[PDB]
Amino acid sequence: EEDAGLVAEAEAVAAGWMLDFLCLSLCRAFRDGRSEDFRRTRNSAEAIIHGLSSLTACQLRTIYICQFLTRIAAGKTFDERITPLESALMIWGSIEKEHDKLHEEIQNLIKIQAIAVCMENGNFKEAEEVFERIFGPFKSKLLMIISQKDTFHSFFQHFSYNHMMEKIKSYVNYVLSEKSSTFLMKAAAKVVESKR
Amino acid sequence: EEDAGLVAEAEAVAAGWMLDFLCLSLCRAFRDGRSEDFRRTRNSAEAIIHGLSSLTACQLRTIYICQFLTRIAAGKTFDERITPLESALMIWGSIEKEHDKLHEEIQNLIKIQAIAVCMENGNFKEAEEVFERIFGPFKSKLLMIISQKDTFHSFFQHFSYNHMMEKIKSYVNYVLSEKSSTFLMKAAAKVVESKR
Ligand SMILES: COCC(=O)NCc1ccccc1
Numbered sequence: 548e549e550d551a552g553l554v555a556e557a558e559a560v561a562a563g564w565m566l567d568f569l570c571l572s573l574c575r576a577f578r579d580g581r582s583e584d585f586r587r588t589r590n591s592a593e594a595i596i597h598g599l600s601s602l603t604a605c606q607l608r609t610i611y612i613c614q615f616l617t618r619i620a621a622g623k624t625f626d627e628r629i630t631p632l633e634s635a636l637m638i639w640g641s642i643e644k645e646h647d648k649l650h651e652e653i654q655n656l657i658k659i660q661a662i663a664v665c666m667e668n669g670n671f672k673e674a675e676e677v678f679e680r681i682f683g684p685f686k687s688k689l690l691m692i693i694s695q696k697d698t699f700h701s702f703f704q705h706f707s708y709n710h711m712m713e714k715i716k717s718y719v720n721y722v723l724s725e726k727s728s729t730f731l732m733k734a735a736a737k738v739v740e741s742k743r
Numbered sequence: 744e745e746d747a748g749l750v751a752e753a754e755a756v757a758a759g760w761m762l763d764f765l766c767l768s769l770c771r772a773f774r775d776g777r778s779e780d781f782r783r784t785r786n787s788a789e790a791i792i793h794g795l796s797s798l799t800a801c802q803l804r805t806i807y808i809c810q811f812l813t814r815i816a817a818g819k820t821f822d823e824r825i826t827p828l829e830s831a832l833m834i835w836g837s838i839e840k841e842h843d844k845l846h847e848e849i850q851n852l853i854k855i856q857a858i859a860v861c862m863e864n865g866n867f868k869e870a871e872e873v874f875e876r877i878f879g880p881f882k883s884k885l886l887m888i889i890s891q892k893d894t895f896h897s898f899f900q901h902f903s904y905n906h907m908m909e910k911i912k913s914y915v916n917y918v919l920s921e922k923s924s925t926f927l928m929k930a931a932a933k934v935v936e937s938k939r
């Protein structure tokens with residue numbers, strides 16, 4: 548007989564398979580709004596990721612998408628001394644991905660919702676602290692909104708939580724379609740289709 | 744397209760595959776004495792087991808073997824208000840398995856080591872408490888040994904920690920050989936063999 552190195556290699560291949568499968572499940576639970584399922588899959592993905600010490604460019608992209616969705620899911624709820632949405636913003640700006648229209652739309656919606664979720668929770672001192680960290684005449688208008696506790700300002704209705712979630716969900720559908728063919732999920736589906 | 748029920752079924756099949764793979768890895772790490780690898784695989788197995796709500800007779804046996812090895816590995820280190828080895832003893836006596844010579848040998852070695860590890864750590868009041876919970880003229884001899892702090896008594900040399908670990912390791916080799924053919928590890932090895 549038994550070679551330790553070849554067994555460790557087989558375990559690394561299987562960890563790679565489990566990572567893609569759990570990213571796929573995390574994406575579907577996020578899209579579906581299945582919170583408890585998302586929590587469980589996130590816990591599993593995090594544990595499996597600890598079993599890997601070297602990651603390829605594709606695997607790094609996979610773990611960062613998982614970390615990003617984890618912070619987005621904790622958006623209305625931590626070493627950092629920033630908020631979950633501010634942490635999602637840092638991950639989003641560092642993933643190896645195209646900075647296209649969708650990327651910029653998601654970035655700006657997260658920037659504004661990082662402030663709006665603090666106002667929604669009644670913590671306006673924190674909303675000013677988040678604003679200072681992100682931004683830190685457009686800025687003067689946003690800082691006046693927070694100062695006046697003008698939570699339902701028309702600006703916040705265009706840059707809403709629901710709009711942020713919808714744009715992120717559209718991005719998740721592209722990740723979901725790119726990984727729907729990964730080894731583990733594909734083999735699992737073939738077993739279920741044989742039953743039936 | 745997309746059926747929620749068929750996707751959930753494919754995820755349950757894949758969780759079942761991951762469970763056997765992680766049990767195999769936990770068994771090899773236990774046999775090899777790779778403590779940090781055992782800790783990581785245990786964390787992964789525990790997270791994956793949370794993703795299952797219904798288990799077959801075979802899967803229940805798998806999770807209980809994992810729980811048993813986890814308590815054995817924590818033997819010298821928790822709802823219960825008993826010790827890790829006492830907890831392993833409860834799992835061992837309830838697994839759906841044959842109560843053969845090896846089973847009885849492992850049971851008795853765990854019973855004595857649950858007391859001896861307390862003496863090894865210098866906690867003799869705890870050694871008496873463990874003795875009372877398990878047992879609770881043979882008993883009178885064991886209670887005299889603990890009372891006299893006679894840690895290196897010849898009885899403890901036949902019913903040693905090393906003998907307990909060796910007998911448990913032989914049992915692990917049977918579990919290891921029964922699962923070496925499971926889907927995930929078998930497919931992982933075929934990929935590594937194609938490289939080499
Ligand atoms: C807090 O720092 C660690 C961290 O990023 N945990 C979140 C996570 C969720 C899912 C997969 C990997 C990681």
Ligand SMILES: COCC(=O)NCc1ccccc1
Nearest residue numbers: 785788789792806809810813
């Ligand atoms: C403490 O109660 C929960 C428990 O048994 N955790 C240990 C465990 C280790 C590996 C697989 C499943 C479980």
